[PDB]
Symmetry: D2
């Protein structure tokens, strides 16, 4: 599918995160983040087709996950406003990037698995 | 303080209070011989479970009663307990501390070793 | 889809762990673990077909991951001898259990997804 | 004691992360991050005396951890550029905030524990 993938899981429910707001930002020469892409996590807990391979380029991107929206809907008070993931992309070749995050009311753990297709 | 166990709660965002801690030791018969047991304090860390002279090289298993603690808080957990097995003092005496961040249906364990 | 699946990731390299020994046990009335199944992690790092729904029944199952063997092969000495995931299966009814274990030399994180 | 404390640990070595850059920001009226305080992680891996009780305010704050700089000294190529923790401070009243971060080359986990004085 798309080179960029996002998966989110909630510890409290033990079920994949559904209806999650994720925003992708792209670096600019003015040191400002531009709204590269936005999407909503599916009921399966993953987001596919976020960015086309050709559109995806060599840049520093920022990925933000809206922690409050999921926790406010569930009714649990969240400590973090959002989870922010920033990294460089395509240092050498058009390698695919998968972003995985684990959510909790007062903590979160994120990991990225990198594959070369 | 040869061995320390620090336990933290994710949902409450506060250190876990009175989590059952069980420490075992390996035997020649491939059976665990109970070493020590305790309950966590208010700060969440239980200390003094072992003494350096008594603390000896071997394969030790540390059990944390996650089910007993979290069920008391009133929601059903997934893991029956957490087992942290590890050889102790492979090369000389060292200070071992175990950190376990608890959550329903998921947990993470991290250990910090200190040579002196 | 297999009733039980195990996904193992190596945060150190950032790529899924390959050739990881995964052992499954069963609780007995004598408080003794009986080997249920064993396998080796594939290239994708996920194990499928390790158990069948017919054999898979309610009980207390322990999943072992040979972290010490894997990290020794890569040349890194790990703190934990292995990872044990003890849980109760089908307490209420038939459910699909997925085990996710993120590995590290001196730490690990276990996460379960229920379908 | 200290209203804001930060503890950082490395999963690769199982030791406190020494000489790690920590940066604290505060929200302004124009939605611009204004630097508040910054320090280097000590040998024990914890920061003490970063915010004063009077100076610490009820605004929004951000804590940034320079994971990439730490890995460069070790010599391991990291995935993430840095780790950022964004949270509302003093929603109700004075509080003691402790931020704990576990670092890995391609993943990290952050947890927050609060003490009521």
């Amino acid at each position: 599918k798309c080179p960029l993938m996002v998966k989110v899981l909630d510890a409290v429910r033990g079920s994949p995160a559904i209806n999650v707001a994720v925003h992708v930002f792209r670096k600019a020469a003015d040191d400002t983040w531009e709204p590269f892409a936005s999407g909503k996590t599916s009921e399966s807990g993953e987001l596919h087709g976020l960015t086309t391979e050709e559109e995806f380029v060599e840049g520093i991107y920022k990925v933000e996950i809206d922690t409050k929206s999921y926790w406010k809907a569930l009714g649990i008070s969240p400590f973090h406003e959002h989870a922010e993931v920033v990294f460089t992309a395509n240092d050498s070749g058009p390698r695919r990037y998968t972003i995985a995050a684990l959510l909790s009311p007062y903590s979160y753990s994120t990991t990225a698995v990198v594959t070369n297709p």
